[PDB]
Coordinates of C-alpha atoms in Angstrom, one line a residue:
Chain A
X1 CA 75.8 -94.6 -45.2
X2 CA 76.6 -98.5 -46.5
X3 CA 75.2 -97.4 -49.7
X4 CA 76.9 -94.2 -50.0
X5 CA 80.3 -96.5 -49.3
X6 CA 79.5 -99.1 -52.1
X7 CA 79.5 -96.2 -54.9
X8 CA 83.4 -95.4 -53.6
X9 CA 84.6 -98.8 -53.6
X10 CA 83.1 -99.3 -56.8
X11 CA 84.5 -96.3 -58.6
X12 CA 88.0 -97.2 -57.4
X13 CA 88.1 -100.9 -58.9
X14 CA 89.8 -101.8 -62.1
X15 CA 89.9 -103.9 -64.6
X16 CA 91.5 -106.6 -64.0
X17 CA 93.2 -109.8 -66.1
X18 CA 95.1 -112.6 -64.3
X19 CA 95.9 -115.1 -66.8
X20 CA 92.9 -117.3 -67.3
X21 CA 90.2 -114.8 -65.5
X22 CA 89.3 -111.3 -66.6
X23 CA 86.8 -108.7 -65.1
X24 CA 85.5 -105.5 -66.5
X25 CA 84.7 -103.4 -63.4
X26 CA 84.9 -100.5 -65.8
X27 CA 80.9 -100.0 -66.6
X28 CA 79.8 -100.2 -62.9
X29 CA 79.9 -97.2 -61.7
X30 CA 78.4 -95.6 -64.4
X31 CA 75.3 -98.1 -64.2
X32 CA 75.2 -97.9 -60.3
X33 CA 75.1 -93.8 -60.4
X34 CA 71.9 -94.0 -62.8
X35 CA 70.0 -96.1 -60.3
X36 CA 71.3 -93.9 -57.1
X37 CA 70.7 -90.8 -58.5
X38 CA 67.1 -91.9 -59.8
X39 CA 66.2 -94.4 -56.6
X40 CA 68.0 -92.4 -53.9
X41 CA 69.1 -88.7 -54.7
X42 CA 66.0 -87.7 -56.9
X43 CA 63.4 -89.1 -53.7
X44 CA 62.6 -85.6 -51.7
X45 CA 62.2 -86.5 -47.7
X46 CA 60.3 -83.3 -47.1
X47 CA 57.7 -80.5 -47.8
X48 CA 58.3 -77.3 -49.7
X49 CA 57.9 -73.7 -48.7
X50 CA 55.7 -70.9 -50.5
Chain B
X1 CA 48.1 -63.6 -59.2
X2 CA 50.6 -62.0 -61.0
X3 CA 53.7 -64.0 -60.0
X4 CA 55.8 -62.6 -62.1
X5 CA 59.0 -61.5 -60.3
X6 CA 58.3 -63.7 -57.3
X7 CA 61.5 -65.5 -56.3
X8 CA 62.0 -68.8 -56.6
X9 CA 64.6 -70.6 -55.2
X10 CA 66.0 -74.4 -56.5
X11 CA 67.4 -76.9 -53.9
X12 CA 68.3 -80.7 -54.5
X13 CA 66.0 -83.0 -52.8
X14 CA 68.2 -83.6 -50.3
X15 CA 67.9 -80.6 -48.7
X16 CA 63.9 -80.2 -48.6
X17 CA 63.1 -83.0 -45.4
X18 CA 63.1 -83.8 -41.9
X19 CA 65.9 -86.7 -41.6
X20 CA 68.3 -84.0 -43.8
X21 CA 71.5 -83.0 -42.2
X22 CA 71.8 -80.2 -39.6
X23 CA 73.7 -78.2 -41.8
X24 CA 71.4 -79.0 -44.3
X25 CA 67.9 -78.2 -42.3
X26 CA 69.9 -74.6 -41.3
X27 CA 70.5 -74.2 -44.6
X28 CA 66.8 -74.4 -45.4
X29 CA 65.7 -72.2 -42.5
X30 CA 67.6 -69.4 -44.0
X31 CA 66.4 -69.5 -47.2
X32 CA 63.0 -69.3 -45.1
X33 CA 64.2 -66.1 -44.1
X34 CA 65.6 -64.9 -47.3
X35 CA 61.9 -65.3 -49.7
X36 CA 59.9 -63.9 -46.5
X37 CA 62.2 -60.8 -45.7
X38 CA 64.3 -60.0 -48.7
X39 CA 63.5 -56.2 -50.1
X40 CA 64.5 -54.1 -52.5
X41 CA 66.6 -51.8 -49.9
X42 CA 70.6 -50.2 -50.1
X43 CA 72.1 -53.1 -48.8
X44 CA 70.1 -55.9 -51.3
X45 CA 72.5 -58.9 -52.4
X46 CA 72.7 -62.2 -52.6
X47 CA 75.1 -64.9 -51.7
X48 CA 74.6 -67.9 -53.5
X49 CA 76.7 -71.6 -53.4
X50 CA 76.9 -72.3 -57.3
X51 CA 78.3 -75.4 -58.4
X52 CA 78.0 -76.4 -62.3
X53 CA 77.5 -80.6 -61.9
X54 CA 80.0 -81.9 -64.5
X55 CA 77.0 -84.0 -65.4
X56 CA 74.3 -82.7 -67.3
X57 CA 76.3 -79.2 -67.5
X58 CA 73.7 -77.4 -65.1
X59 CA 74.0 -75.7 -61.9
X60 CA 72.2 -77.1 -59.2
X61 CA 71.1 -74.2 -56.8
X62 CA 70.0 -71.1 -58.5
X63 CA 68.4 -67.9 -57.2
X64 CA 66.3 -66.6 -59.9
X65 CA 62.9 -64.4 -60.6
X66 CA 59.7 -66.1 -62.4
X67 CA 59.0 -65.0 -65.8
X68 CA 56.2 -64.8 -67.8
X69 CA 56.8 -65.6 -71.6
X70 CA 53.5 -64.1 -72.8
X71 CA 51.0 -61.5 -72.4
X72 CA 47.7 -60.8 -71.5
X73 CA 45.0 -61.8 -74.5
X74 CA 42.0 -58.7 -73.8
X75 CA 43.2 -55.0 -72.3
X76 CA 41.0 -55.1 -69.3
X77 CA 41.3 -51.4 -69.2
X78 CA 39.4 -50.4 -72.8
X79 CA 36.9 -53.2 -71.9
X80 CA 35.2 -51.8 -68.6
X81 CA 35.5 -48.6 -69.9
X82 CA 33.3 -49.4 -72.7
X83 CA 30.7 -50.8 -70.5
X84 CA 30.8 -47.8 -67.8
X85 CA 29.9 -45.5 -71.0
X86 CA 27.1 -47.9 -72.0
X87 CA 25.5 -48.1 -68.2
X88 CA 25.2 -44.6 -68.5
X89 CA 23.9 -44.2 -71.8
X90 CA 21.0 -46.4 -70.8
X91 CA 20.4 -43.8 -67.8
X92 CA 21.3 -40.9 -70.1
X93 CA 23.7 -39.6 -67.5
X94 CA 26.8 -39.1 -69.6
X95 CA 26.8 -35.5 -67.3
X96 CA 28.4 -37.9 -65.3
X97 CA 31.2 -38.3 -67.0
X98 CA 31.8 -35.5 -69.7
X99 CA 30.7 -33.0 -66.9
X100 CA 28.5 -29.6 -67.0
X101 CA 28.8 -28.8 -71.4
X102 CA 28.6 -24.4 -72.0
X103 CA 25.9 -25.4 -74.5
X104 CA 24.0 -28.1 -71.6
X105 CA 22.1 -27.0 -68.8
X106 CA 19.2 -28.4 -66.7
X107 CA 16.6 -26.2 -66.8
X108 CA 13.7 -27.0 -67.5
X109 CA 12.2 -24.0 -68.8
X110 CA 15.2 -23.1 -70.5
X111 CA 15.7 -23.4 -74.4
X112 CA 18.4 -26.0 -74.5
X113 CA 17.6 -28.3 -71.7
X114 CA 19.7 -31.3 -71.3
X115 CA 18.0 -35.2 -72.0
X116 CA 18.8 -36.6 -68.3
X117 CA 17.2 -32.9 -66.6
X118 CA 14.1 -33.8 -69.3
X119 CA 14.1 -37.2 -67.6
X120 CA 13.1 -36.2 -64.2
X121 CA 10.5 -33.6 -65.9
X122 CA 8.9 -36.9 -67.3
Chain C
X1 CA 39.6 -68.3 -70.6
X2 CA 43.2 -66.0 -70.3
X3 CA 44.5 -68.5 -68.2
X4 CA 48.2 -67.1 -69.4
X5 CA 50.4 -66.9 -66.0
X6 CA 48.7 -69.3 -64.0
X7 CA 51.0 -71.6 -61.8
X8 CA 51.7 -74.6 -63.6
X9 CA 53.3 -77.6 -61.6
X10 CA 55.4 -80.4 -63.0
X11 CA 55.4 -83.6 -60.7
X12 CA 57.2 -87.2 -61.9
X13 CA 54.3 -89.6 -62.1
X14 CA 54.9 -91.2 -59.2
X15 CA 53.9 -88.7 -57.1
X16 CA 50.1 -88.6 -58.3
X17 CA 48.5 -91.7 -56.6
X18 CA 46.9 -93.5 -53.8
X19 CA 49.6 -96.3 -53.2
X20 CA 52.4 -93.2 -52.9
X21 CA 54.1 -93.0 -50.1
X22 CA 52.2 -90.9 -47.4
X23 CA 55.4 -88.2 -47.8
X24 CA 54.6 -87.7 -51.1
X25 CA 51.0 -87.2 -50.6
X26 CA 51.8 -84.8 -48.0
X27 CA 53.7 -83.4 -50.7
X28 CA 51.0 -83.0 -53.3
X29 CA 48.8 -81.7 -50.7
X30 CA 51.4 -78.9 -49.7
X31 CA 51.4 -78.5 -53.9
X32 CA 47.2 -78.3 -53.7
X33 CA 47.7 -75.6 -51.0
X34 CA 50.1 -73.4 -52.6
X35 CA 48.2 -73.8 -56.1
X36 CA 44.8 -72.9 -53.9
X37 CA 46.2 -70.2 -52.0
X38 CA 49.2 -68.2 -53.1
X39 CA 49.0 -64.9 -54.2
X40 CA 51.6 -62.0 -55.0
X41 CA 51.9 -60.4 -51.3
X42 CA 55.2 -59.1 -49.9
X43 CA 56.7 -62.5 -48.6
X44 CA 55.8 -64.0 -51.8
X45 CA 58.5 -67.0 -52.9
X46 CA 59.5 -70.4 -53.3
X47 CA 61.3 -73.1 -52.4
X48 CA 60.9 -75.6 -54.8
X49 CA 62.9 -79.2 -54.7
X50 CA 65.0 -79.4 -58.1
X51 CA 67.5 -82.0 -59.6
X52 CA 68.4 -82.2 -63.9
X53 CA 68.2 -86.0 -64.0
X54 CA 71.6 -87.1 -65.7
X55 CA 69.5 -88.7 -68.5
X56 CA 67.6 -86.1 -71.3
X57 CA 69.3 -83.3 -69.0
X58 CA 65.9 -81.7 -67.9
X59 CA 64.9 -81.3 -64.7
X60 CA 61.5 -83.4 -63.2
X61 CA 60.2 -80.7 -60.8
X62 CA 58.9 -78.1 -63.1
X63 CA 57.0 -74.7 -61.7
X64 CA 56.4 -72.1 -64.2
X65 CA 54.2 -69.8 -65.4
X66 CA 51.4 -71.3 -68.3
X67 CA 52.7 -68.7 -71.1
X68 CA 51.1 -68.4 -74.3
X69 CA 52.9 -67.6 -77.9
X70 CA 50.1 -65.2 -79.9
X71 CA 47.8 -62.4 -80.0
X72 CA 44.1 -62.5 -80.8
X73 CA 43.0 -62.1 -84.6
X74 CA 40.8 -59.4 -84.4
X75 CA 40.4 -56.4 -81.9
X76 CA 36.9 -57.0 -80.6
X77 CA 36.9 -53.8 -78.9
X78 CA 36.7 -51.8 -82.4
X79 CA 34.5 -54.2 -83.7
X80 CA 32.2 -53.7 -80.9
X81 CA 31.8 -50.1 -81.1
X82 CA 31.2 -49.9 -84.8
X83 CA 28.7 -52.3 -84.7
X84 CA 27.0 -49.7 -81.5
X85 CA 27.6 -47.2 -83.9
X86 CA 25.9 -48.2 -86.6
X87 CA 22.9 -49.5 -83.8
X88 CA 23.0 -46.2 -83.0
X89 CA 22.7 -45.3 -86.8
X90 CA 19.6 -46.9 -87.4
X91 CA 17.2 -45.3 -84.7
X92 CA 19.5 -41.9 -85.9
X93 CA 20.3 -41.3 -82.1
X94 CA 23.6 -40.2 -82.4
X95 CA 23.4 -37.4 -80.0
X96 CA 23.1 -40.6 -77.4
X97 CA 27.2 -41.1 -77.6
X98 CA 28.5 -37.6 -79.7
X99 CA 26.0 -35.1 -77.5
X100 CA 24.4 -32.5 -77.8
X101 CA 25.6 -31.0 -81.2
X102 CA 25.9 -26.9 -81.4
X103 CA 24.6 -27.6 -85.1
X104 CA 21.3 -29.5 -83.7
X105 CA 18.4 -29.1 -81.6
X106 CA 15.2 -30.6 -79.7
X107 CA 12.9 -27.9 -81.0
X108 CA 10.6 -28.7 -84.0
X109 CA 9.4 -24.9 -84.4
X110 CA 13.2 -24.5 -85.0
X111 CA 15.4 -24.3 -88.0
X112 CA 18.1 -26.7 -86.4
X113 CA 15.9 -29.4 -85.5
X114 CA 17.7 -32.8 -85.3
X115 CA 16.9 -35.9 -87.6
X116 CA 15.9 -38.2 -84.5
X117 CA 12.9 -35.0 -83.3
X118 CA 12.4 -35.0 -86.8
X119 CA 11.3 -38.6 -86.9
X120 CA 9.6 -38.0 -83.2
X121 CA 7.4 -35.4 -85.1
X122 CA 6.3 -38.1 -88.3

């Protein structure tokens, strides 16, 4: 469920530049969806059916 | 084992388990239904949830038949008949198979007997 | 060897081991079974786990059918029977596969008699 949460918060941030400090928030998401989708979604919790 | 036409049906992973959703597990069960009881009856049909991930352009349920993209090396068919011919050539019983000839009979004393009615003479 | 359309399974890597987690073993057990066992009765189907990984845009769970892309060279069939043919040929006992011939016969004293009771009689 946390984990699920992080990806949302992620995708919503911005980048952002106060003068003196700036932070690309842009290329998160798309490197946190490669490791959910491969460490998470792709990992079946069951047996199939013939 | 000739699968071909057997459906298959494509889940994500999340569906397939144990700690899956309710919603999810019911969805499973009925599919359970669906490849044991489906027919080819009046009131055959299918509806399917489709959804086309804007990644990787592919759907990610699908409902579809196994297919074969080749065929079958040796015709079975000519090759037993071949050796069914060949067993009874060795007994000389090809009466067998041709059946009773107008020129063929099994007498013995007869002028054109056949070769497996000489065989039991011997 | 025509192993064309036998069940092929496509597992990640990861799955194959002794370290994997017991789920997964229970899983490529459940895979030995259905390779083992299943056949093309009337509640023949499938329900196989699927997801196109976002990277290369193929799918890691692969079941399909081993298919094969040619035909045999020659037609052993044909090739078999000539070469019977011509063993026939050589001991001149055609009348073993064609039959009894209305143009032939077994009788020496006769005018019709065949080539193989002609070689009986040398």
């Amino acid at each position: 469920k946390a984990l699920k949460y992080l990806l949302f918060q992620v995708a919503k941030m911005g980048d952002e530049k106060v003068g003196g400090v700036y932070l690309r928030n842009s290329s998160r998401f798309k490197s946190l969806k490669a490791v959910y989708d491969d460490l998470v979604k792709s990992s079946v919790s069951g047996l199939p059916y013939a | 084992r000739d699968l071909v036409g057997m459906p298959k049906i494509g889940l994500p992973p999340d569906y397939l388990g144990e700690d899956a959703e309710p919603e999810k597990k019911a969805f499973v069960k009925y599919c359970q239904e669906v490849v044991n009881d489906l027919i080819a009856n009046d009131r055959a049909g299918l509806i399917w949830p489709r959804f086309i991930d804007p990644e990787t352009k592919e759907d990610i349920f699908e409902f579809s038949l196994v297919s074969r993209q080749g065929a079958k090396a040796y015709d079975t068919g000519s090759i037993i008949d071949r050796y069914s011919k060949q067993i009874m050539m060795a007994f000389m019983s090809d009466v067998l198979a041709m059946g009773q000839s107008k020129y063929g009979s099994f007498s013995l004393a007869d002028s054109k007997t056949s070769l497996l009615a000489m065989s039991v003479d011997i």
